[PDB]
Amino acid sequence: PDLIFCRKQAGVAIGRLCEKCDGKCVICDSYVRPCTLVRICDECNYGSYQGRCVICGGPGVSDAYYCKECTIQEKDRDGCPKIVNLGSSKTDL
Amino acid sequence: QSKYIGTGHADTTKWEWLVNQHRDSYCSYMGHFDLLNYFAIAENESKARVRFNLMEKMLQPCGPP
Amino acid sequence: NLPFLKPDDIQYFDKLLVDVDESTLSPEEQKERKIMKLLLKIKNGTPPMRKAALRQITDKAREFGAGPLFNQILPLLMSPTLEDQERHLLVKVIDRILYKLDDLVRPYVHKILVVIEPLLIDEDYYARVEGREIISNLAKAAGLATMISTMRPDIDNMDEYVRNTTARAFAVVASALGIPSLLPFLKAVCKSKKSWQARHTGIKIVQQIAILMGCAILPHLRSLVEIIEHGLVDEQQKVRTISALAIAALAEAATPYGIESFDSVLKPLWKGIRQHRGKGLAAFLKAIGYLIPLMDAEYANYYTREVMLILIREFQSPDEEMKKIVLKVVKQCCGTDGVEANYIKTEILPPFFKHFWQHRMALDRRNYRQLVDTTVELANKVGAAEIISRIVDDLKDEAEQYRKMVMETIEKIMGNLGAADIDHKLEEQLIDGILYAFQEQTTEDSVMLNGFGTVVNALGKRVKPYLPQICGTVLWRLNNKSAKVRQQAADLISRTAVVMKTCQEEKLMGHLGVVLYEYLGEEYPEVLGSILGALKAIVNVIGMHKMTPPIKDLLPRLTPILKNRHEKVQENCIDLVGRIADRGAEYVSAREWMRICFELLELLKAHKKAIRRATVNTFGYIAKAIGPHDVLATLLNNLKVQERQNRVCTTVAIAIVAETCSPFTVLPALMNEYRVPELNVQNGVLKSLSFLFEYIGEMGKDYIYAVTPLLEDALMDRDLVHRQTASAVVQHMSLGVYGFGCEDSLNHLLNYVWPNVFETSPHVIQAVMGALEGLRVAIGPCRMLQYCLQGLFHPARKVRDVYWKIYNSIYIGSQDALIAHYPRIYNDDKNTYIRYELDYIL
Amino acid sequence: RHMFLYNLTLQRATGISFAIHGNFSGTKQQEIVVSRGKILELLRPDPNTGKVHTLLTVEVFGVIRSLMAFRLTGGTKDYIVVGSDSGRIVILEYQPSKNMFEKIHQETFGKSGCRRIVPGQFLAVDPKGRAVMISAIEKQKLVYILNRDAAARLTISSPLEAHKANTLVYHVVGVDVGFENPMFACLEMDYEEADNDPTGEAAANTQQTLTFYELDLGLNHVVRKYSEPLEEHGNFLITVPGGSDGPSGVLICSENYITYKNFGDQPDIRCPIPRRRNDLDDPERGMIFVCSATHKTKSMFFFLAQTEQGDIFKITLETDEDMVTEIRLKYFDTVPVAAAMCVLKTGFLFVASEFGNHYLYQIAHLGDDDEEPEFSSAMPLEEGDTFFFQPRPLKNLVLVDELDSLSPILFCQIADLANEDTPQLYVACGRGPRSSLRVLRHGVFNQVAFPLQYTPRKFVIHPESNNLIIIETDHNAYTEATKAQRKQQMAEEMVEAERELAAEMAAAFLNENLPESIFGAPKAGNGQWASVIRVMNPIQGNTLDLVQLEQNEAAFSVAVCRFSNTGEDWYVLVGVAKDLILNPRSVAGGFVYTYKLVNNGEKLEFLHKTPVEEVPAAIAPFQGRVLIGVGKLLRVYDLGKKKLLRKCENKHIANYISGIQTIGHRVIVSDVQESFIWVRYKRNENQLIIFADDTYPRWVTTASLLDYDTVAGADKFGNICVVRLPPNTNDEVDSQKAEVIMNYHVGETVLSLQKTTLIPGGSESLVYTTLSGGIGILVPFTSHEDHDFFQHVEMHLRSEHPPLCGRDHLSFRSYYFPVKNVIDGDLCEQFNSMEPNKQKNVSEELDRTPPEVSKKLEDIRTRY
Ligand SMILES: *C[C@]1(O)C[C@@](C)(OC)O[C@H](/C=C/C(C)=C/C[C@@H]2O[C@H](C)[C@H](NC(=O)/C=C\[C@H](C)OC(C)=O)C[C@@H]2C)[C@H]1O
Ligand SMILES: [Zn+2]
Ligand SMILES: [Zn+2]
Ligand SMILES: [Zn+2]
């Protein structure tokens, strides 16, 4: 599988996470010290994708947060953290 | 990596890196107020004139390649 | 090749299945073929395929022409089996081709509208959004004149449905091209002499413009009102009704600004109040109710006194829409500055509670919510006791819906205001009614629980005389056969524990706690979690020494409950054990605590973050209670023995112990566990150090020196996992002690991290780059630039690649700082390279 | 030993880089929001008393690069949009009840620091408050859409991209297009062609363009609509009102020209800037505007444009059928060069000068009634010919208030010269003819000021008489003698042209001297200089002696010393450079003037001048002889009856020496780019040997040795460092690297450092004075308990009370080097500014009460 980050200009949408990855950093897969709130671009939050998990793409239950390490290194300024698969379409789940 | 202008590769020339760092320095002078203050005092020019001269230098800071 | 095709796609892409050859078919057929290919790559393609196909279909939209492009797109857009994201992609390609096509779509505008307009009435909100977006792009591409010429013939239609459709679409084009562009057309149509259908349609256009644009219509509110005002005195009743409704929409969209714009509408509405009846009367009332919150205090009082006669008259109206309208209008009036509380108490409250607060209203859910919110808003101004006293005696009604209604109303009133306005008689009435409504519950109405809790917490210490009665009722409901009633009683205990403790009635609370102990071990997980939470609240509010049952007998009962699979039971049991460990550790032996800790290690890998946080907190409490030594020895034995799947729990527990009892009681033993020549336990010690430093952050500022030799031994050990985990340790250290004076030890560890940059394996070079960025943060970009410059320009190409990768990381990291760290490069015969501004001397 | 410092700003920065006016209170009163650099201030001028009161001051812990106000349709209170170094856009609303700035919105988009491609430098707003554009210097440009909600609260949207690679932005401004789609005018220039042509033709042919970015609200996207190449490069833009209040369009200010442009069939209307009649500056020198101001009225509107000389011109436009006809310019007045001008209602004008004090004048007369010549663009003129006007004192403005400003502080010395128990701060600051030496006493700071001729560079106190020896140097300035010579040559040229009237005009021009302090000193000639030596009594500020210098001589060092070969007689050496043309740096030679201080330090007599190869930038007395830093060479000089002899020298300093300080048998060389270098000189053998350097390079500006093995230095980039030689360091070794034991970022370029004690009996502290006008102190810690307490206070303030403009405090204080053992007291003292809930929570975290923490902070304040 070929997965990558969106890295588009994020907006006012709040990123969310499902029950499997509650309170986990989307960038470095860390579970310690959630710091800043995750923002995603409008394309990844439009329509049936609103409030959907950033990692897998399922029903999100909590707010996604960066960790303190990513905040200090300013890895939250890079762009939309939405994981996207280059080997699948919009209809694929 | 055209997202970040100053980034480089194994084929980045000395002239490219130096004009990049010169433009970085000029924009930092534009940003930090006390740097512009020092430059306007030493050169004895109005802050507007110093900013205009820096923006003019921003075209070819190091000259033609 | 070609992407996958769904069944329903065949109908739209059958010609692409056969691999025909070009030039054999007509050149017009070759256009359709490429349009099919582009649309198939867009609809069912990968992101790169979609981007390439979008760029291709935009860069050739003029060559393709509007005709075949839309003749292929529109059937696909209205496929009954089209996904929502496919619809969004089609909307986007339509927007792009409309921008490229521009005036070429004028002959096709109508052909598009008859397709798009249904989306504006679809139940899907995003479908309506996409329809509006398509119409906006079409109006921007075709022009205002084309849209007016194409949509005008449907204005005077006698369908009343296509009229609403055309009004909505005209509002969309108005929001697309701006109100001033469509102002002359509206001023002309709203004064049409041909028929009243045109006036009705224009006024509906104004209404939909308001509804769609909201606060954006404030600049042109005067123009809209002056164009629409003449319809209030028209001969047709439908046009007067739509005029009033559009006035209400304009007022709602302009809240709370722009009352002077409605100056020419106040007296017409005021007279129509006394003149009209029926649906027109309701529309006038709605417009007035939405207009009132825009007026000054004195004029609000004047207008409200003028319209309140007819408001009270229509209080007893048979039309349910009329009742909803007048209820909203009352809520709007009594929520504005100017309507005195005494005036509402005198003239509004008696008829309000006479005609509205009737049993029937408690059956319909919409009327239920509307009347509850209106009554709470009334209490928010006229006072809590003035409203509660009129509905408190209804707490003992025979209809359960009416009891639920009055209970929710009292709950919201007392939660928004309080109990300082309540006298003694009203307090007794509240207590009696709450007890009667709670004892007479058919189901488990959560509103009753919320009301009981709210009223108890609002009374505070005033509930003490009734505490024996409430405790007896909670006892009787706790023994109930039904489990949900037991759960509701436990939640009521959890919500009233603090109030019962403040009232100084510890014996009743101890009896409740011993009954909860007796009911512990309930099979139903939700009831067990609720009684665990109740026990937690009781233990937290009461003293551990005088707590009945004793903690000595309570904690061993809680020990096996952690093995339950239900997350609620897990969280509640963990929280109770943590409270016990915090304020009552003296009543428990160290062996029980050790067994609790060993049964608590699994819950560190739970998916629920709340369970993880609770487990961490309770483990920290137990470590503070006992001490680090015994638990740390057992945890190191576990780390040495257990398999790699359960070692992360041990690592997290080690970090918790090191953070709670200071790391100088943990780092020596952890580093000592490295001397054994087994590789797996060495990797485990390295991972423990990594997570420990990442967890303690700033606290590890006094421990980098101690661990530096272990790292420098692992940094150059001829093992890949060793160097990887050691680089992870260095990264977490650097990010943790960032800005606390560790530049010496970190600059030392940099010299051991740097030789590992020329490594081929990816998993280790990733950790090396992470350590390098952490060290850039901790030591500063200057040292990193100093180490990069020596290899930035090297004859070796791979060396240049690696050093430029590191330089790119540093440059993205801190670009503004590097300006003060760049070295000197003297000028040559061709270029100027020295920055002379930085050489100035004052 | 261990240096744990506590930073406290005693005097906030008084300079101003941005100033806007608006109804930030929500009432009819007009207030002024200014930026001091890292400080956001809110001032209110009372129209009754005509005085400016300061209502709010907040340390934002960032670098404000762009500041502007706006209002939404139907609103009654202007908001505040701030562009910082944070990569975040911030919108705030002043609340007069709580007297604070409430962060309404904060949206992230980029990285921190004054970066070249990350927006923050430029800020434009749509005049109807519907959208705001934030732009960088290069490519990146973002547009946010603003609206209201049900409760009339500001709502911001997602950003819309408007980037364009290889595009340098000179200035952005929002265009008043009524209630149409918002538009932003940009002065851009594409450099892609320049870097691909090694002949240089592309750079000389690439011209500046004026482009218009239109934000379509229906399509909800930003598009680059129009783009027109410009004749000459403009330096900034002015928004002329539009809609129903004006004809819309834009005003471009360039070199010696101002143009009006507008999209559509509207032609371009340009007009040359009127030059001063009988101007004394170089004819080749151009004339541009430095700032602008716009005043709208129910009737008409106008603009105020200030030139480089300080002349304010009032500008009006003629319009016929919503189309401009001409640009009317008229000389309004002349005040010092301002960074921003605010034309408030109720007839007032606030002028925030770039350097020196700021002023508030009252507008008495608009000026139209006067017979003074009004210039227009329709007047015929030869291409080279420009208009002429006569400057005169204030006619339409009357000064009603003056705000003191210590910026820019070039040097400072703390000493007791008034023979009081508490020392006074003698601060040589100011720029050009507005420079001054000010005495500061506390007992906030009370100040007195004595004017000076030019910009001071350095000054020393005479120990035997406490009198000050000032050196005042300015670049491209004219000496008094050359000024009179230029006037005489102009008068000679004037008569060669009715001849009786010409001689009378020339005599009247000769007999009239415009005060340089208010009209700006006529300074020109890129290679010229002007230096003056002065003696001053510090108690009454009376000039005891004054020595003018040669036209091409620039003073850069000064010292008072006693020589061993002579008796206790006092000598004064002044290092001077000849024909210093900087950028590109080129110089002829240097001289050292030697004078004999006579009459207990009241006048000096010329002895001899000693020539030398390059610039003598530092002069430090070394017991018997003296030490001088000429270029990259450090020499010892002995006093001879004829000149100054070089008994020994060292030439291994890597770059230019900027400062030299000696203690015992050691000497500390301050390289311009490299850090400090340690040199030891044995009395025997007579040779200076380098025995220690640094591991980090530092652009040093000043220094102050704290003890034998330590030194403290100030950076050009607003940093303070403290380094120390390692233990067991001998002087007969070649290679030693100094350990850095303290690093800190102040946010303002510090130019004076001195270890002293303000109040007698208090703890010794380290006082610094910066170029931005601020004065701060560093106090060392005594016990580890207090250090840990204040460290926890700083940690909790960083998280619970973050900086105002989105910056990270720990990152800001680590701008160029990571923080090392410094606690920011300006952040800690903000504990009293938080809400009671957060104060109670943080105090319970530290096991004490909010009043106890306030009392601890006040104890530190009173200790000093
Ligand atoms: C997004 C995912 O990657 C999807 C999936 C299916 O990936 C395989 O599931 C992932 C879930 C992983 C979990 C739940 C890992 C458990 C780990 O447990 C160890 C013991 C660690 N525990 C902690 O760090 C616990 C507490 C910390 C200190 O504090 C807090 C507040 O969390 C790490 C993991 C939680 C999912 O991520
Ligand atoms: Zn995205
Ligand atoms: Zn997920
Ligand atoms: Zn992270």
Numbering used by the authors:
A (entry chain D): 6 to 98
B (entry chain B): 15 to 79
C (entry chain C): 463 to 1304
D (entry chain A): -1 to 441, 773 to 826, 831 to 1197
Which text from the study accompanies this structure?
Splicing modulators alter the splicing patterns in cells by binding to the U2 snRNP (small nuclear ribonucleoprotein)—a complex chaperoning the selection of branch and 3′ splice sites. The latter contains the heptameric SF3B complex, whose core subunit SF3B1 is recurrently mutated in cancers. In this work, by employing FR901464 analogs as molecular tools to dissect the splicing pathway, we elucidate how spliceostatins/sudemycins interfere with prespliceosome assembly and splicing commitment by covalent coupling to a reactive zinc finger of PHF5A.
We have engineered a variant of the human SF3B core that lacks the β-propeller BPB domain of SF3B3 (SF3BΔBPB). The complex formed crystals in two alternative space-groups, belonging to the orthorhombic and trigonal symmetry systems. Our best orthorhombic crystals diffracted X-rays to a resolution of 2.3 Å, while diffraction data for the trigonal form was limited to ~3.0 Å. Strikingly, SSA’s epoxide group resides close to C26-PHF5A—one of the four cysteine residues of PHF5A’s Znf1 zinc cluster. The electron density is continuous between C26-PHF5A and the epoxide group, while absent between C26-PHF5A and Znf1’s zinc ion, indicating an intermolecular covalent bond between SSA and C26-PHF5A. In turn, a water molecule appears to occupy the freed zinc coordination shell in the trigonal crystal form. Concomitantly, a water molecule likely replaces C26-PHF5A from the coordination sphere of the zinc atom, resulting in a configuration reminiscent of the active sites of zinc enzymes (e.g., carbonic anhydrase or alcohol dehydrogenase), where a water molecule and three side chains coordinate the zinc atom. The resulting thiolate anion attacks and opens the epoxy ring to form a thioether bond, while K29-PHF5A contributes to stabilizing the leaving group.
